[PDB]
A = this chain, B = another copy of it.
């Protein structure tokens, strides 16, 4: 689909069998979601935002569906204000910016 930007580009994602709302964010290097349980081991990671840095948990090779498109990749879990789909997964679903 073609998504205009008059409103937030919010989509439904499915992760761990649950539906959640997330924002398609070209300004985010990686994907970060609010607290939830994910399988496997995690690694430490620091990500920087407008307000400063936060610690997150990095989970690898996580199955995630984005607006019905199947992706498998890195998902960070932490104190984010909104669920964000970053470039690591936008590239998997073949998302580009056009003007």
Q: What residues make up the interface of A, taking CB atoms closer than 8 Å to B?
A: 1-6, 8-9, 23-29, 32, 47-54, 67, 69, 80-82, 84, 87, 90-91, 93-99
Copies in the complex: 2
Residue of A1, A49, A80, A82 ringed by the most chain B CB atoms within 10 A: A49
Is A90 a contact of B5 with CB atoms below 8 Å?
A: yes
In Å, the complex CA distance between A90 and B3 comes to: 12
Known contacts A24-B27, A51-B48; A87/B3 CB under 8 A: no
The answer, among B8, B53, B69, B98, for a CB contact under 8 Å with A87, is B8
How far in angstroms is the closest Cβ of chain B from A33? 12
Residue of B nearest to A27 (CB): B25
